[PDB]
Amino acid sequence: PIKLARVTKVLGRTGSQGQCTQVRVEFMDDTSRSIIRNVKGPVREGDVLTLLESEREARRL
């Protein structure tokens, strides 16, 4: 199910060429869930983000 989330702060950009941005994001249906996710492109605080599936947390070196 498609779900909508809201970011809190940016953890920092990752990738070999710095292509993705690892960011801390949370949920509106409950204000208790908190996951870390990678989103590429220009990301600043305030945008509303879209999850196709909320199962795993994104993780890269």
């Binding site: 990678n38 590429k40 990301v43 983000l49």
Partner: protein, 102 residues
């Protein structure tokens, strides 16, 4: 054609043709794989605009079909979500290959 404001059709085409999830390329030595990453809403708008641009440009390109009416048809079919749009097909391929490379 639609009998109402073209701005609503344009913003619906922008919304419906946004790639919500795609793949990034990684690799250390020769072996290159793809990881399913997310697209920011600003980049969603940017890629939707570029995909409608490519659809309008390489839609006809060799016959009587005018660029204005081709752009209108592409925007209308993207707002309706039909499979005739090149932007919609490319976007759907993007989320499908994102799902193929979780």
């Amino acid at each position: 054609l639609t009998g109402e404001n073209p701005l609503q059709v344009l913003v619906n085409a922008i919304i419906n043709s946004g790639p919500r999830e795609d793949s990034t390329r990684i690799g250390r030595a020769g072996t290159v794989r793809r990881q399913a990453v997310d697209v920011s809403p600003l980049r969603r708008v940017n890629q939707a605009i570029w995909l409608l641009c490519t659809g309008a440009r390489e839609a006809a390109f060799r016959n009587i079909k005018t660029i204005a009416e081709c752009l209108a048809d592409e925007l209308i079919n993207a707002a309706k979500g039909s499979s005739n749009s090149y932007a919609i097909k490319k976007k759907d391929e993007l989320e499908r290959v994102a799902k193929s490379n979780r």
